[PDB]
Design a protein around this ligand. Sequence first.
Ligand SMILES: CC(=O)N[C@@H]([C@@H](O)[C@H](O)[C@H](O)CO)[C@@H](O)CC(=O)C(=O)O
Ligand SMILES: CC(=O)N[C@@H]([C@@H](O)[C@H](O)[C@H](O)CO)[C@@H](O)CC(=O)C(=O)O
Ligand SMILES: CC(=O)N[C@@H]([C@@H](O)[C@H](O)[C@H](O)CO)[C@@H](O)CC(=O)C(=O)O
Ligand SMILES: CC(=O)N[C@@H]([C@@H](O)[C@H](O)[C@H](O)CO)[C@@H](O)CC(=O)C(=O)O
Ligand SMILES: [Cl-]
Ligand SMILES: [Cl-]
Ligand SMILES: [Cl-]
Ligand SMILES: [Cl-]
Ligand SMILES: [Cl-]
Ligand SMILES: [Cl-]
Lengths: 292, 292, 292, 292
Amino acid sequence: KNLKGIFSALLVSFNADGSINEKGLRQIVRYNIDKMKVDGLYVGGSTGENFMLSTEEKKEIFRIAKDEAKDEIALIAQVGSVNLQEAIELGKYATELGYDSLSAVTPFYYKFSFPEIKHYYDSIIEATGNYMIVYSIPFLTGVNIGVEQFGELYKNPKVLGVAFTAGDFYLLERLKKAYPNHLIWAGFDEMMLPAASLGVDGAIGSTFNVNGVRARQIFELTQAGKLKEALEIQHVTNDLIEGILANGLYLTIKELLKLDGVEAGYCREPMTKELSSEKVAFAKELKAKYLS
Amino acid sequence: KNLKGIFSALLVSFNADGSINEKGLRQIVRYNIDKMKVDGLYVGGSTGENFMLSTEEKKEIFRIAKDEAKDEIALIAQVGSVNLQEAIELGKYATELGYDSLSAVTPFYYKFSFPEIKHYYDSIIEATGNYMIVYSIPFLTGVNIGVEQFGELYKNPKVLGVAFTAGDFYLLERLKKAYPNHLIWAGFDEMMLPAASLGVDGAIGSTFNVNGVRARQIFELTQAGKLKEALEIQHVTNDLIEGILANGLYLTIKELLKLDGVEAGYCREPMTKELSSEKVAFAKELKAKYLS
Amino acid sequence: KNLKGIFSALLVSFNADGSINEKGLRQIVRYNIDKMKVDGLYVGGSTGENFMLSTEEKKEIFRIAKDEAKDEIALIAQVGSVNLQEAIELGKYATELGYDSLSAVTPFYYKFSFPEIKHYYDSIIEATGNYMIVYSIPFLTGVNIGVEQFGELYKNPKVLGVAFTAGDFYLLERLKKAYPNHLIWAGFDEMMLPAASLGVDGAIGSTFNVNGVRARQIFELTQAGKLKEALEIQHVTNDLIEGILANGLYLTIKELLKLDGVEAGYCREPMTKELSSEKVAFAKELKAKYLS
Amino acid sequence: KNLKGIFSALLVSFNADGSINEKGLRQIVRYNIDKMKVDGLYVGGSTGENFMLSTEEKKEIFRIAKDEAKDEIALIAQVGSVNLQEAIELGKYATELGYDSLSAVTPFYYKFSFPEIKHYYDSIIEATGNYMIVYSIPFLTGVNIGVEQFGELYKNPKVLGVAFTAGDFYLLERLKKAYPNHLIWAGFDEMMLPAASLGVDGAIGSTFNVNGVRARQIFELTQAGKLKEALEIQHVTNDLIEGILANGLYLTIKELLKLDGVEAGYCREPMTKELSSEKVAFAKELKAKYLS
Ligand SMILES: CC(=O)N[C@@H]([C@@H](O)[C@H](O)[C@H](O)CO)[C@@H](O)CC(=O)C(=O)O
Ligand SMILES: CC(=O)N[C@@H]([C@@H](O)[C@H](O)[C@H](O)CO)[C@@H](O)CC(=O)C(=O)O
Ligand SMILES: CC(=O)N[C@@H]([C@@H](O)[C@H](O)[C@H](O)CO)[C@@H](O)CC(=O)C(=O)O
Ligand SMILES: CC(=O)N[C@@H]([C@@H](O)[C@H](O)[C@H](O)CO)[C@@H](O)CC(=O)C(=O)O
Ligand SMILES: [Cl-]
Ligand SMILES: [Cl-]
Ligand SMILES: [Cl-]
Ligand SMILES: [Cl-]
Ligand SMILES: [Cl-]
Ligand SMILES: [Cl-]
């Protein structure tokens, strides 16, 4: 499949006790495919609360997402972990499920050297035989990969490019300049327009599973050169995103899904599991102003 | 005058002993006006080696720049300093010289509170009666001003906006959204295109006093919606800028001015005063590839 | 048991394939008890490569260490995780093994609020009924808990104090002023003397695996006010630690164990699994100079 | 003179208009010598609000302090600046006054290379013929010099050691190991005990202006190995310092001086020039609790 364009970073529905709610998770997937009209899903990312889950849970989410989506859309499986043996086990499972590409966060917590980082990517690829997308998220991992280092990663022909949840647009431009055949997916939804202006190939975003219509319009208008209109739509989206961030990101996207009848459920502990009354009321105001 | 568009951050020619070379400084000003075709000059900024100079030297530079440029172009005088009494003295002098606006760096070194910062801006404005442009450069000062704080600064009607040498494009978009009548000048030349895509009103840049032709083309093509062409010109400019940064920023821009017959002189100690042979040869290669 | 004094952060022996080497792990435990004469072991900390391992592997390590040590020394089980359900499962298992206290890293990766972090500690305690030591390691997690926040955690009376792998000695002194009955274990071996001078109750350290004799001397001499002699031993200790850090921290402590007959094995991928030959020779030099 | 021991970082008395109050500055100097019984004064440091002042004002302060103190105590002149020609002019003037050593902050604001920083120290020394103390204050300048780099500075035999306003006690111990004949003055008053335990040669501190008696006791008791008694005095000291930091550091030390009859005056804009009335009462509480 084509891996360009708009990918929601899939949110997962949890029950009160923190178990996966399969019915809810399917409604989320269905909603992204049918109503947000995404090109694909990025499953197991930070937005899916992935790092708070067990390996078996992560497998269940991969299985459920793929069974619901089938081949209607492109699917990318984020399998990265500080535990390389887990990342390999997950990448094999996702590959056998038919995921179109793997993705892996740079290994974190410990301060890994660049050679260790590369060996981690190469090891997942060798064990799975699947494509790989580097998942770069410096504001969470503390890891900053430079132009020449991405090029060493790109010496492995199964590495397709980078899910770039980073805000350095000089680095962004330089990666496009040096590796014009490798892909970049912008990761910060509130900076989609300036990333689109630099020729990114698509975007992966949490807010796309409620705002995926505007997200597509910004992306398409910008790359068609209609910046005045793309900018307008970016301004309204950033009103919504500022609202969502203030109110509590994952819970608030989930609340916005609930207001459209998607049983998007609780967040997983240790995240706060549920919005207070006041925050529910604020999310309803966001819905009325921006998504109704 | 109109303060929109392309402003070179003026470089200053020094002699071997660190004194200002007036003939050189005039040739720099002349070159920006006549060959780079800038809309204005930003005098006394970080690029002018301002923070390594005495108050009397800074005054001489203001006097010389204004006497050479006259009213051919817009002139902005950066007068900020950890010493508020110096900043007031400089802002008065620049105002009496006819500078179109003042600008001041956020006070630095000490960790000033936001109220102290605002009192500094308001004090300069009250003493001078001139317009003020906030000079925000977090990667040097460590000071990060937020949307609501810019709005408190903008309660003073003589504050025109911000010289934004910062790379947070979410903040950038938010400032345009909240204060659509206040101006923003992008400060990172290697990120001009994505800043132009968000509707900045112009740019202040060191590299414009050798690359001000391409800088204008990126700015105009982007805001006319021709992103494919603006992107191309941004890629070549960033090859040049990457070169310049690797070789030594201020010295290398000065070397590029010398290759066009501008006596751009030495840098001021404690900066390295002169390029080595090897670095001169590299700057000549930059000239041959990008500016000939 | 008395939980004061010298605790080695237990290293784990791995096979070439990343699996646990039980014989090797047992010999490490024995070497600590019998040769390093430690007061206890801190098991499953960052030093034990814990965050690269499966839930089952962590349990296996808890089981082995307890089996070897029996009740000859104190044992603390680090059970913290970004996965709260994992932390609870591990905390219950270590509690059933008869671990003298649990400990848990502040939840990391995601940017959790202080209420969420407190809820995480309280939930582990509620589920296990065991003592809890907060594991604070800001340079790996980016989380910095302040004096008032420690006080809120200390409202739970099963919270004993803090494994303070942190370098702020004003915070350290302030915690002892505020909470004089709560314990502190210093976590930077190379700053043992100044931490001991502030009246910490013990220390938890990776290098105590090989240098536990000097570590006890620094600690005991410092608390007796014999600073001249403590400082001497700290200088030699720090020559060794500087060499260990330059050569590769966990690999080099393992090599130093191997040089004494202990089957300390490989590191676990994605860490580099073995030293280069050059670095093996360097560990031999350290052994000859500092440990023979 | 012997440059070891307890040095207050001299505060400066300002008038309402920001000018120097000579009578007030003289009374501060006298209070230090006569009541705080300091070994010396560190004049023109960050504590003296130096970086907010003109060249002439700095000279006036050097002149006054020397005039009052004569040879009753040691005197060190902080003459560092981003302006090297300024540092040289000040260094020559303080040397002509008979200052026992110069000192200079690492050049800041710009991102200077280590060679440029060394050239700056060497140039000041060459121009003045006086001793030099490196002033290291990473939390204000962002500059962190490492052990090998200190060694390169120490190749100049007029470099005596370092005013270490820094909190890394591994670096501290490593500097004493490597350069045992070079001096270190600890610069964080609230970490005096652990610094003294590592064998620093003295301390330079703003709070010594009002708490010099306890500061000498902590320092002397620590070096005698009377840690229990040193720690007590450090706890009380740190109750006072925590209150001073919460209330506004330089203003509150000035208020505490005023409460003893010393005309310590205002702070200099852009610092807040005087305490709110509420905070004046709070300084009175500190005085009653800690200093009467
Ligand atoms: C950490 C995070 O949530 N990042 C989001 C963003 O879409 C982000 O939520 C949004 O731009 C607001 O910050 C995307 O990059 C997708 C992603 O990294 C993920 O799977 O979490
Ligand atoms: C610190 C600095 O040089 N900034 C330049 C940039 O133009 C910069 O030189 C360029 O983008 C490369 O980093 C501009 O922001 C202008 C400026 O701040 C200045 O006066 O120095
Ligand atoms: C991160 C780490 O390894 N820290 C060690 C230290 O002993 C450290 O290895 C030593 O001070 C060298 O920096 C201890 O704090 C124990 C600990 O946190 C651990 O199990 O990792
Ligand atoms: C930045 C500052 O004020 N530092 C003081 C300290 O004494 C400090 O005020 C005190 O430890 C409270 O943090 C000393 O290091 C002396 C010094 O650097 C100075 O003159 O500012
Ligand atoms: Cl970032
Ligand atoms: Cl390519
Ligand atoms: Cl920035
Ligand atoms: Cl406005
Ligand atoms: Cl207590
Ligand atoms: Cl020495």
